[PDB]
Amino acid sequence: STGDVTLTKTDATTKAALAGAVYELQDATGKVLKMGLTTDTTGQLTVSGLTAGNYQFVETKAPSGYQLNAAPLSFTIKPNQTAVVTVAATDEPVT
Amino acid sequence: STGDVTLTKTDATTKAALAGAVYELQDATGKVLKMGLTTDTTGQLTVSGLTAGNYQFVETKAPSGYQLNAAPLSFTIKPNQTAVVTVAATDEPVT
Amino acid sequence: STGDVTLTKTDATTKAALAGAVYELQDATGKVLKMGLTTDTTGQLTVSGLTAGNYQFVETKAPSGYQLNAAPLSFTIKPNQTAVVTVAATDEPVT
Amino acid sequence: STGDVTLTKTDATTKAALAGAVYELQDATGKVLKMGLTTDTTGQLTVSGLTAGNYQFVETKAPSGYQLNAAPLSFTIKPNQTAVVTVAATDEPVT
Amino acid sequence: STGDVTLTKTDATTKAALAGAVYELQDATGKVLKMGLTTDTTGQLTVSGLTAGNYQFVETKAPSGYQLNAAPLSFTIKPNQTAVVTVAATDEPVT
Amino acid sequence: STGDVTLTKTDATTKAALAGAVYELQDATGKVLKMGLTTDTTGQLTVSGLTAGNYQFVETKAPSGYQLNAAPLSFTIKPNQTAVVTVAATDEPVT
Amino acid sequence: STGDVTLTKTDATTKAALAGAVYELQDATGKVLKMGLTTDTTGQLTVSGLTAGNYQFVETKAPSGYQLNAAPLSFTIKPNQTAVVTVAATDEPVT
Amino acid sequence: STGDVTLTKTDATTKAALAGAVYELQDATGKVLKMGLTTDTTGQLTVSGLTAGNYQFVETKAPSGYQLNAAPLSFTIKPNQTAVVTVAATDEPVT
Amino acid sequence: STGDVTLTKTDATTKAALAGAVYELQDATGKVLKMGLTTDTTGQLTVSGLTAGNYQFVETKAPSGYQLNAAPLSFTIKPNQTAVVTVAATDEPVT
Amino acid sequence: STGDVTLTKTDATTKAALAGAVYELQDATGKVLKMGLTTDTTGQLTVSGLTAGNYQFVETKAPSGYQLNAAPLSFTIKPNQTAVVTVAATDEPVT
Amino acid sequence: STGDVTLTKTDATTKAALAGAVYELQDATGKVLKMGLTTDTTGQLTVSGLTAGNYQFVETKAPSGYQLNAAPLSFTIKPNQTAVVTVAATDEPVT
Amino acid sequence: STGDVTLTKTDATTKAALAGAVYELQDATGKVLKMGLTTDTTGQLTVSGLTAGNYQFVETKAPSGYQLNAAPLSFTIKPNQTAVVTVAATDEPVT
Amino acid sequence: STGDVTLTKTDATTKAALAGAVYELQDATGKVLKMGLTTDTTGQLTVSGLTAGNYQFVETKAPSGYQLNAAPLSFTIKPNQTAVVTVAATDEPVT
Amino acid sequence: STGDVTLTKTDATTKAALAGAVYELQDATGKVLKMGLTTDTTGQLTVSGLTAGNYQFVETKAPSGYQLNAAPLSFTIKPNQTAVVTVAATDEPVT
Amino acid sequence: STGDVTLTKTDATTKAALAGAVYELQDATGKVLKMGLTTDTTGQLTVSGLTAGNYQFVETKAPSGYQLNAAPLSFTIKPNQTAVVTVAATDEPVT
Amino acid sequence: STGDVTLTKTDATTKAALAGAVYELQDATGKVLKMGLTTDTTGQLTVSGLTAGNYQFVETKAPSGYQLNAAPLSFTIKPNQTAVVTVAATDEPVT
Amino acid sequence: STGDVTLTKTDATTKAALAGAVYELQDATGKVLKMGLTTDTTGQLTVSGLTAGNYQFVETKAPSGYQLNAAPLSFTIKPNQTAVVTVAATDEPVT
Amino acid sequence: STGDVTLTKTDATTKAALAGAVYELQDATGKVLKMGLTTDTTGQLTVSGLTAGNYQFVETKAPSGYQLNAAPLSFTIKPNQTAVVTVAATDEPVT
Amino acid sequence: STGDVTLTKTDATTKAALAGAVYELQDATGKVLKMGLTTDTTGQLTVSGLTAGNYQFVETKAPSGYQLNAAPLSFTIKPNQTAVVTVAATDEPVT
Amino acid sequence: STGDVTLTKTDATTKAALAGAVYELQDATGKVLKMGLTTDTTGQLTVSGLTAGNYQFVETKAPSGYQLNAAPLSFTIKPNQTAVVTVAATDEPVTEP
Amino acid sequence: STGDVTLTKTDATTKAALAGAVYELQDATGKVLKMGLTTDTTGQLTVSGLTAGNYQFVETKAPSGYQLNAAPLSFTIKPNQTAVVTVAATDEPVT
C-alpha cells in the first residue's frame, strides 16, 4: 500500500500553530523528493500516497519572525501502514 | 499572517498572455523553494500562503516559440499585507 | 472576431495591487471610447469584445495617496487574437 | 415611465451581424449621454430604462475592416412606450 | 455547415417593434420553403439551420393597422457562415 | 397586441376528440398563412400570437376513418383581445 | 373503465371563451349528479372518471352579460372510451 | 371577468372560528348553484371564479353543538372587482 | 373537531373494487349536503372535515353494468373521533 | 398557551376587502399594547402568540375614502385556545 | 399475472377504523401462507402480488379492547384481474 | 391601492448613511400610527402598504453621537401611487 | 392512434449524413400538408402524430453543394402502428 | 455600529420560561421607543440593531396567570458592542 | 480601501421617486469620470468601489416632464469609509 | 457473518420466470423459520442476513396453472460466505 | 480522427423499423471485428469511435418473421469525418 | 417484440454464485451470435432485446478453479414473450 | 418525561454575555453529574434531556478577566415540564 | 475473485495515444473470448471482471495510417489480485511502397 | 497550445500497476522542471498544461520492494497536441 504523513508546526515558546513554514521532503539519504510543502493556518501539512520507506522533512523557510532550523525530522512509512504518521516541528522566535 | 502573489506572463512584442511558462520561486538568496509553477491561458500563476519575506521568480522553461530569460523577478510579501502582490514578466519571440 | 484586454494596476514601490484607479479607453488617436473603467481589489479591470485595432488606456484618477500619471498605455487587439492582451500600469505614492 | 432601444449592426454588403462596433448615445442636440456601447456577436446592443425623449446613436469605432460612419441614427422613446424601439445600422467594408 | 437568419420588424414611422407580422421564406426563384413565420414582441423572428444559398422573406400578413408590402427582402447564407444574417423590415401604418 | 385561437376536433357522431386532423390557417381571402397544424390527443390545436384580423381554418387531411370537409371555419382575432377564441370542428365517419 | 368529458363555453357572436358559466351534470333522465361546475379563463370545464352512460350538461348560471340557456347538451361516455369527449356550448349576449 | 368570495364562520359568543359548517351558494332568487361548501379550521371557505351577479350563502349544516340558521347571507360580485368579497357568518350554541 | 369518512365500493359477486360509482352525502333526515362523490380505481372516495353528526351515503349512479341501489348507508362522525370512519358499499351486476 | 386573532376589514356597503386600514391592539382597559397593525389586500391582519386575556382592536387610520370609526372591537383569547379568534370590522365610505 | 387484495378493519358498532388487528392469509384449504399481517391507522392492510386462486383472511389477534373472531373472510384473485379485491372485516368491542 | 415610503438617514456633515436612527410614523395631525422604525446599515427604512393620505416621520432617537431633531418630515401617499415616495433626513453630530 | 416517420438524408457517394435538406410532406396524391421540414446534423428529420394514410416526402431544397431531386419518397402510416416508419433519401454532389 | 439585547422571561417560582409576556422598550428617561415586544416559547425576545445608549424594558402585559410588574429592567448598548446584552425578568403567579 | 455612493432622485413637489434621470460623475475639478448613470424605478443609482476623494454628480438629462438642473451635487468618499454615502437630488416639473 | 440466498422460479417446459410462487424457508430439520416468500416478475425471491447453517425452501403455493411440488430445495449458508447462494426451482404446468 | 456509423433496419414491405436484427461488423475483406450488434426499437444500431477505413455490416440473424440476407452493406469512415455515416438495411418478410 | 434471458452460474457443490464465467450465445445450429458474456458477482449475466428464436449458451471459459463444460444450454425466446427466460448453469470444481 | 435547562452567563457590570465560562452540573446534594459545560458567544449553555429532579450549576472556571463564584445556582426539572427552565449566572470583573 | 486489465495503444514514433485500434481477448491457447475491444481517445481500453488465468490481446485492426501487428500481448490475472494489470501496445506508422 | 502526458508504472514481472513511484520531470537536457510526481493506485500519473517541447521522466523513488531505475523516459509534446502522450515505465522487484 502507501501511507500518509502530517507535520504540525508551532512556535516553540507558545505552542501556537504557524502558517507558511516551507519544507522539503527528502529520502533518508537526503535526496529531495518534494519541495515547497507549506503549513496552513492550523500549522499542518500532509503528504499522502507515500510508498513505504525512510524519509525526512527539512525546513527550507521559517515563518517570518522565526529562526530557520534545517535539522531533518525523520519518519518511516511502514508497509501496510494503517494510521497516519504525524510529526511535530517547532520554531524559535528570532532574537 | 501570509500573503499572495500573482505573476502575469506575456509576449513582449504583442502583450498577449502566454500559457505554459514554467517558473521557480526562490528566496532572495536564490534558494529554490518551489518549482514547476506554470502560467494558465490568461498568462497567470498565483502562489498563496507565503510568509512575509523577500522572494524572486526565475523562469525555467519559456513557452514554445519564446526565448528563456532567467533574470529574477523580485518581490516582497509584507507582514499583514492586505492586497495581492503582482508582477509582470515578458518573453521575447524566437527569431 | 473580437479580443479582450486586462489591465493590472500596482503601487510602483511595493508591487501591491491597487483598487479604485480609474481609466479611459482611447483609440490610438486619443479619441475616448469608454470611460470610468475602475480597478478591483486584485488591481485588475478587463474590457471584452473589442474589435481589432490600436488602443490605449489613460489614467483619469489615481487611487487615493498616489500620483496621477496620464501617459497612455498602448496595446493592440489583433484580428485573430486567441489570448487576452494583458498590460501592467503602476502608480507612484504622493510626496 | 421608461423605454428600451436595440441597435443591430451589419455588414452592408452581406447583411451579416458585426460584433465590436462602438457607439455613443446622444440626445437630439448631440450631447453625449453614454459612450462605449458595443455590439455583441448577434450584432446587437440594447439600452434600457431611457426616459421619453429624442435620441441618436453615433458610431465612434467601426469594426475592423469597415469604414466609420458617424452619421447620427435618430430615434424617439415615447412616454408610455410598450414595445422596444429597434434600429438598424450598417457598415461598408473599407476600399 | 448551416447558418441562421433573423428578421426584425418595425413601424416605419416610430421604429417600434411590431409583433404578429407573418412571413414566407422563399428561395431566390420565389419557391416557398417555409410559411407562417411570425414576429414576436421584440419584432423578431429567426430561422436556424438553413443551408447556404440565396433566399428572400416575403410578408404575407401585415400587423393589424399596417399596410402589407410583399416586396421580397433578399439575403444570402454563405458556406461556413460565422455570424447570423440579420435583416430589417418596416411597415407603413394604414391610410 | 396579439391573440390566440384554439380549434377542437371531434367525431360528429360520438363527440369524441380526434387526433391527427390536419389544418391550414388562411386569411379571410383564402390565402394560406400556415399549414400542417395537427390536432393532439385531446382533439386540440392552438395558434398563438396572431395579429387582429379575420381568419379561417380549412381541413386538409381528415383523421383516418373520417371524411374530409374543407369548408372554412371562420373566426376573428380582435384588437386587445383578452380571451382565447376557441372553435369546434367535427368529422363524419366514412360510411 | 371510466371516461372524461370537457365542455368549452363561448360567446356565440365572437367565439371568445367565457369564464364563470356554471353547469349541472345530469344523467339522461335529468337527475342532477354534480352541480357548480364552472368554466375557467379558457372557457373549459372538465369532469373526469365518469362511468359509461348517457349524460347531459345544463347551464345554471350564464356569465354576466349573457342569456341563460338551459337546453341540455347531451353526451355519451362509452365503455371502453379512449379519448376525451368534448362538447361546445355557446351563450348569446343580452339585448 | 370573475371575482372571489370568502366566508368566515364563528361561534357568536366567543368569536372563535368553527370548522365543519356546511353551506350552499345560491343566486339571489334562491336557486342552488353549489353545495357542500365546508369551513376549514380557520373558519373559512372561499369560492373563486364567480361571474358578476347577486348571490347568497345558506347554511345547510351547523357545526356540532350549534343551532342551524338558514337565513341567507347576501353578497354581490361586481363586474371588474379587484378585491375579494368577504362575509362573516355566526352560529349560536344550542340551548 | 371534525372527522373523515371513506366509502369503498365493490362488485358484490367478485369483491373487486369499482370505479365511477356516484354518491350523495345526506344528513340523517335525508337532506342532501354534497353530491357527485365518485369512487376511484381502488373503489374509494373520502370526505374529510365533517362536523360530528349522523350522516348517510346514497348511491345516485351505479357503475356501468351494475344495478343502482339507493338504500342509505348510515354512519356517524363522533365529536372526538381519532380514526377515519370507513364503510363498505356493494353493487349487483345487472340481469 | 397563547392564541391568535385575525381581523377582517371591509367596505360596509359592498362587503369588499379593504387594504391599508390601521389598528391598535389594546387591553380591555384601553392600554395600547401594539400599534400600526395594517390590513392586507385580502382585508386581513393577524396577531399571533397572544396570552389569554381580554383585548380590543381600535381603528387609528381608515382606508382612504372611508370614515374613521374608533369604536373598540372586543375579543377574548381563552386559555388553551384551540381555534383562531376571528373578528370582522367594516368602514363606511365618506360623505 | 398477479393481483392485490386490501382488507379494511373496523369497530362493528362505530364503523371506525382499527389499527393493529393481526391476520393470517390462508389458501381455501386453510393452509397458512402468510402471517402477521397488521392493519394500519386507516384500518387497512394490503397484500400485493398474489397468484390467482381462492384465499381467506383469518384474524389471529384482535385490536386491544375487541373480541377475536377467527371466521375466515373469503376472496378470489382472478387471472388477469384489473382491480384490487377488497374485503371488509369488523370487530365487536369487549363488554 | 396602497403606497410605499422610504426614509434615508445621513450624517449632515459627511452625507454618510446612519444605522439605528429611530422614527415614529404619524398622520398629518400628529397622531402616532407606528413607532420604533429603525434605519439599517444603508441608512434606510421602508414602510409599505400605506393607504393614501398625509403623513410625517418624527425622529424619536438619534444615532449615538448625533443630536435628536424631532421636526416632522412630511410626505403624501397618493391614490394609485406608482412609485415609492422617498424622503431624506439628516442628523447633526454632537458638538 | 397516430404514427411517426423518420427520414435520414445522406450524400449518395459517401453515405455521410447531410444537415439542411428541406422537404415537403404530401399525401399520396401530391397534396402538400407540411413544408419546411429540415434535416439536422445526424441527417434526420422526424414527423410525429400522423394519422394513418399514405404519404410522400418531396425535397424542396437540397443541401448546398448537392443536386435537387424532387422524386417522392413514399411511406405508409398504418393504424395502431407500433414501430416508427423510416425512409432513406440520398443527394448527389453537383458536377 | 449597533447592538443587540435578549430578554429571558420566567415564572419566578419555577424558573420555567413564559411565552406571551408583552414589553415596551424605553430609553433611560422612560420615553417609549418600541412596543408590543412579546416573549416566545423559550421565554425569549431579542431586539437587534439598537444604537448605543441606555434603555429599559417595561412589562405591559404579563402572561395569563401572572402578576403585571412594570418595574424597568435597565441595560446599556455600548459602542462597537461585540457581545449580546442579556437581561432576565421574572413573573410572580397571581394569588 | 474604497467606498460606495448612492444617489436618490425625486420629483420636488411630490417626493416621488423618478426613473431615467441621467448623471455624470465628476471629480471636484469638474473632470468627467463616468457618464450615463441612470436612476432605476426606486429613483436610485449606485456607484461602488470609488477611491477616497472629492466628487460631484451633475445631471445630464432630466426625466421627461422635468427641468434639467445641472448644479453639481458634491460628496466625499473618505479613506476608511464604513458606510455608503447617500445623496438626494430633486427635479422640478416643467411649467 | 451472515449470507444471502436467491431462489429463481421457472416454468419447467419454457424456462420462463414465474411470479407469485409462495415458499417457506425451513431449517434442515423441517422447522418453518419464514413463510410467505413470494417470487417477483423476474421469478426471484431473496432472503438476506441468514446465519450460517443448513436450510431448505419448500413451495407452499404454486403459480396459477402449475402443479404444487413441495419437495425441499436444500442449501447451505457457509461461515464467512462471500457470494450469494442461488437455487433454481421449476414448476410443471397442470394437465 | 474517428467516426461513427448508424445502421437502420426495416421490414422491406412496410418500411417499419425492426428490433432484434443481429449484425457483424467486418472490414472490407470480410474479417470479423465485432459481432452481436443488435437493432433497437427504432431499428437502429450505432458503432462509435471507428478509425478511418472500409467496413461492411453483415446480418447474422434476422428478426423473427423475416428472412436472413447476409449480403454485405459497405461503408467507409473517412479521416476527419465530421458527420455520422449511415446505412439502410432491410429484410424480406417470411412466406 | 423481443425478449430477455438471464443465466445464473454456480459452483455445483455449494450452489454459490460464480463471477467471471464466460459464455457464447449461439443459435440452435451452433452459429455464434455473441461472445464474451461474463457472469457478475451474483453469478448472473443477462442478454436483452433478443428476437424470438431457439438459442443456446456455451461456456468458453470456466471460473478459475472449475472445469470447463461446453455442453450447450438451450432456451427459446417466444414471440410476445412476457417474462424473462432464466437458465441455471453449474460448474464442477477441479480435482 | 425529561426537560431542558439553559444557563445564561453575564458580566455583572455590563450585562454582556460571556463565552468560555465553565460549569459542573450537580444534583442538589452536590454530587457531580456533568462537568466541562461551557458557555458560547451568546453566553449560553443548554443541558437537554434531564430527568425530573433538583439540580444545581456550579462554576468551575470563570472567563478570563472575571472572578470565580462557585455559589450553586439551583433549579428544578419538573415531571411533564413543558417549557425550558432557565437560570441567569453572573461574574464580577476582576480588579 | 476477479481482476481487471487495461491496454494503452500508441503511435510508436510519437508515443501519442491512438483511438480506434481494435483487439480480441484470447486465452493463452489462442481461443477468442471477446472481440471488438476498441481504444478510446486516451488510447485505452479496459476489460473488467476477468477470472484468474493467462490471457493475451491480439490486434485485429490497427488505426488508420498504421500497420497491423497481430503479435499477442500476454498478461496474467492472479487470484485475489489487488491492482489492475496494465499492458502497453504500439503501432508502426505506415506508408505503402 | 499546451499538451498532456500520462505515465503508467508497473511491476515488470507481473505487469501489475504500482502506486507510490515518484518521478521528476526534466527538459530534454536534464534540467529538473517538476519533482514529486507520484503514481496512483492505477499506476498512473498525468501532467497537463506542458508547453511544446522535449521532456523526460526520471524515477527518484521506486515503490517499496522494487529497484530504483533512474534511466530517462523521453517524450515530445507537439504544438497543437490533439492526443495525450503516453509512456510506460516498469520496475524490477528487489532481489
Residue with cell 384580423: F53
- Give the pairing of strands O85-91 and G85-91: unpaired
Closest by CA position to U62, among listed U89, U30, U34, U26: U89
Q: Which residues, other chains included, contact G17 with Cβ-Cβ below 8 Å and sequence gap of 6+?
A: F83, F84, F85, F86, G8, G9, G10, G39, G41, G42, G43, G44
- CA-based torsion, E93, E94, F4, F7: positive or negative: negative
CA-wise closest residue to I33 among T49, M29, H24, G59: H24
Residue P13 CB neighbours (<10 A): 10
Q: Are J42 and N69 in contact (CB under 8 A)?
A: no
Q: If you compute the radius of gyration of chain H from its CA atoms, what whole number of angstroms results?
A: 13
Here the cell at position M4 is 411517426
Residue type, position B29, single letter: T
- Left if phi > 0, otherwise alpha if psi is -120 to 50, otherwise beta: which for D29? alpha
8 Å CB contact between G19 and G43: yes
CB N62 within 8 A of CB N69: yes
Of the candidates C89, C82, C92, C94, the residue with the CA atom closest to the CA atom of residue C25: C89
**Preferred mutation among H11, H46, H85, H87 to probe J, highest tally of J CBs within 10 A:** H85
CB-CB contact of K90 with K10 (8 Å) = yes
User: Is U87 in Cβ contact with T14 (below 8 Å)?
Assistant: no
Q: Which runs of E-coded beta strand occur in chain K?
A: 2-11, 22-27, 32-38, 44-51, 53-61, 73-77, 85-91
How far from chain centre, in Å, is Cα Q19? 12
Per DSSP bridges, beta strands P53-61 and P73-77 are: antiparallel
- Please tell me whether residue H14 adopts helix, strand or coil conformation: coil
Q: Give the residue among A81, A94, A83 at the shortest CA–CA distance from A13.
A: A94
Q: Are J10 and J17 in contact (CB under 8 A)?
A: yes
Give the span between the Cα atoms of B40 and I17, in whole angstroms: 69
Which residues face D88 on adjacent strands?
D8
Reduced to 3 states (helix: H, G, I; strand: E, B; else coil), residue Q56 is: strand
**Sequence-ordered list of residues with C-beta below 8 angstroms from that of O67, at least 6 positions apart, any chain:** O91, O92, O93, O94
Q: Does K2 contact chain P (CB < 8 Å)?
A: yes
- Chain C partners of D35 at a C-beta cutoff of 8 Å? 32-35
Q: How many CB pairs under 8 A join A and U?
A: 34
Identify the chains in contact with R, defined as 3+ C-beta pairs within 8 A.
P, Q, T
Q: Does M90 touch chain E (CB under 8 A)?
A: no
End-to-end CA distance of chain C: 45
Nearest to U15 by CA among O39, C40, T6: T6
Which residues on neighbouring strands pair with residue K85, listed in sequence order? I16, K5
Strands ordered across the beta sheet of D85-91: D44-51, D2-11, D85-91
Breaks, C-N > 2.5 A, in chain L lie after: none
Rg (CA), chain M: 13
Q: Note whether N61 contacts J34, CB cutoff 8 Å.
A: no
Nearest by CB: O51 against C35, C36, C64: C64
User: Strand, coil or helix: what is B91?
Assistant: strand
Alpha helix stretches (DSSP H) within U1-95: none
Strands F32-38 and F44-50: unpaired
> Could you tell me if O57 and O24 are in contact, meaning their C-beta atoms sit under 8 angstroms apart?
yes
Whether I93 contacts chain G with CB within 8 A: no
Query: Which chains neighbour H (Cβ–Cβ under 8 Å, 3 or more pairs)?
Result: G, I, J
Cβ(B16)–Cβ(B65) below 8 Å? no
What is the full DSSP assignment across B44-73? Answer: EEEEEEEESEEEEEEEEEPPTTB------E
T36: chain Q residues, CB-CB within 8 Å: 25, 33-35
- Helix (H) or strand (E) run with residue I43 in it: none
CB J45 within 8 A of CB J57: no
For chain S, what is the HEC assignment?
CCEEEEEEEEECCCCEECCCCEEEEEECCCCEEEEEEECCCCCEEEEEEECCEEEEEEEEECCCCECCCCCCEEEEECCCCCCCEEEEEEECECC
Displacement of CA N90 from its chain's centroid (Å): 10
Cα(first)–Cα(last) distance of chain M, in Å? Answer: 45
Which residue carries 412616454 as its cell?
Answer: D79
Q: Which residues contact A95 (CB under 8 A, 6 or more apart)?
A: none
Identify whether the C-beta of residue K45 lies closer than 8 Å to the C-beta of residue K23.
yes
Q: Which residue has the cell 399481517?
A: K37
Cα end-to-end span (Å), chain O: 45
E79/M63 touch (CB, cutoff 8 Å), yes or no: no
Which of B42, B86, B90 would you mutate first to test chain C, the one with the most C CBs within 10 A?
B86
How far is the C-alpha of K91 from the C-alpha of K7, rounded, in Å?
Answer: 13
> Whole-angstrom Cα distance, residue M73 to residue M86?
10
Cβ atoms N10, N34 nearer than 8 A: no
Chain T: partners with 3+ C-beta pairs within 8 Å? Q, R, U
User: Which 3 state secondary structure label does DSSP give N94?
Assistant: coil
| Nearest chain Q alpha carbon to T43 | Q49
What cell numbers appear for T35 in the block?
472481440
Nearest partner of H20 among H56, H58, H60, H55, judged by Cα: H60
**Which of E50, E57, E77, E84 to mutate to probe the D interface, most D CBs <10 Å?**
E84
Query: Which bin fits R13, alpha (ψ -120 to 50), beta or left (φ > 0)?
Result: alpha
- Which residues have CB under 8 Å from I49's CB, separation 6+? H19, H20, H38, H40, I2, I4
Q: What is the dihedral of CA J43, J49, J52, J58, to 10 degrees?
A: -30
* Ordered strands of the J53-61 beta sheet: J32-38, J22-27, J53-61, J73-77
T41: nearest Cα among L65, Q49, O91? Q49
The amino acid present at C48, given as its one-letter code, is: S
CA distance linking residue U70 with residue U91, whole number of Å: 10
Place of cell 357527485: I36
Find where cell 366514412 sits: F94
Residue D37 β-bridge partners: D23
- Which DSSP category does R92 fall into? P
Q: Which residues of chain Q form beta strands (DSSP E)?
A: 3-11, 22-27, 32-38, 44-50, 53-61, 73-77, 85-91
Alpha carbon of D48 to those of B93, D75, E6, J19, O21: distances in Å?
46, 14, 21, 33, 12
Report strand pairing: J22-27 vs J32-38: antiparallel
Q: Please give the Cα distance from Q21 to Q30 (Å, whole number).
A: 19
Of D16, D81, D83, the CB nearest to E85: D16
C16 DSSP assignment: B
U82: which 3 cell numbers? 490533439
Query: What angle is formed at CA B62 by the lines to CA B61 and CA B65, rounded to 5 degrees?
Result: 140
Cα Q77 to Cα Q70: distance, rounded to the nearest angstrom = 21
Tell me the C-alpha distance between M88 and N34, whole Å. 80
Q: Is the dihedral of CA Q29, Q33, Q36, Q42 positive or negative?
A: negative
For P88, which residue in chain R has the nearest alpha carbon? R88
- DSSP letters of O49-93? EEPSEEEEEEEEEPPTTB------EEEEE-TT--S-EEEEEEEPB
Distance, in Å, from the CA atom of K25 to the CA atom of K4, rounded to the nearest integer, reads 13
Nearest CA in chain J to N37: J34
C-alpha cell at N66: 401572572
Contact D20, C49 (CB under 8 A): yes
L1's CB contacts (< 8 A; 6+ apart) are J19, L52, L79, L80, L81
Domains and CATH numbers, chain H: 2-91 (2.60.40.10)
**Residue P8 to residue P24: CA distance in whole angstroms:** 14
Per the structure block, which three cell numbers stand in for M53? 394514410
Distance separating alpha carbons of residues H35 and H19, to the nearest angstrom = 16
| Dist CA M6 CA P19 (whole Å) | 38
The secondary element (H helix, E strand) that includes residue T60 is strand T53-61
Rounded to whole angstroms, the Cα distance separating M29 from M58 reads 12
Chain Q residues closer than 8 Å to M50 by CB: none
Strand partners, H86: H6
Contacts of T12 (CB under 8 A, 6+ apart): T90, T91, T92, T93
Side chain identity, residue J15: K
Residues 6+ apart with CB under 8 A from M29: none
Angle CA G38–G41–G45, to nearest 5: 35
Distance CA S14, CA S92 (A): 10
**Partner L contacted by J21 (CB < 8 A):** yes
Instruction: Tell me how far apart the alpha carbons of residues P91 and Q3 are, in angstroms, rounded to a whole number.
Output: 50
Q: Which candidate, S95, S75, S72, places its Cα nearest to that of S86?
A: S75
Q: Contact at 8 Å (CB) between O93 and O67? A: yes
**Please, which residues 56-85 of chain C have a Cβ atom closer than 8 Å to chain O?**
60-64
Residue of H nearest to J76 (CA): H14
SS3 track for I63-95: CCCECCCCCCEEEEECCCCCCCEEEEEEECECC
Q: Is T52 on the interface with U (CB under 8 A)?
A: no
Which chains form contacts with chain B, at 3 or more CB pairs under 8 Å? A, C, U
Report yes or no: A19 at the B interface, CB cutoff 8 Å: yes
Beta strand ranges found along chain J (DSSP E) = 2-11, 22-27, 32-38, 44-51, 53-61, 73-77, 85-91
Burial of R82 (0-12, 13-18, 19+ CB in 10 A): exposed
Characterize A8-20 residue by residue with b for buried, 16 or more Cβ atoms within 10 angstroms of its Cβ, and e for exposed: bbbbeeeeebbbb
3-state SS record for chain P: CCEEEEEEEEECCCCEECCCCEEEEEECCCCEEEEEEECCCCCEEEEEEECCEEEEEEEEECCCCECCCCCCEEEEECCCCCCCEEEEEEECECC
**Which residue of chain M has the CA closest to Q3?**
M16
CA-nearest of B48, B62, B88, B91 to U50 is B62
Residue O29 grid coordinates: 475639478
Q: Spell out which residues of chain U touch residue B36, defining contact as CB-CB under 8 Å.
A: 25, 33-35
Q: Nearest C-alpha of chain T: how many angstroms from R57?
A: 14
Which positions ≥6 away from G54 have C-beta within 8 Å?
G27, G28, G74, G75, G76
Going by DSSP bridges, is the β-strand pair T22-27/T53-61 parallel, antiparallel, or unpaired? antiparallel
Indicate the residue type of R8.
Answer: T
φ, ψ dihedrals at G85, nearest 5°: -90, 135
CB pairs under 8 A between P and R: 66
**F2 and E22 in contact by Cβ < 8 A?**
no
Question: What CA–CA distance (Å, rounded) separates E85 from E76?
Answer: 8
Q: For residue P63, which phi and psi values (nearest 5 degrees)?
A: -60, 150
C-alpha cell at M43: 441527417
Q: Are N75 and N5 in contact (CB under 8 A)?
A: yes
Q: How far is CA O25 from the centre of its chain?
A: 7
Q: Do N69 and N59 meet the contact criterion of CB atoms below 8 Å apart?
A: yes
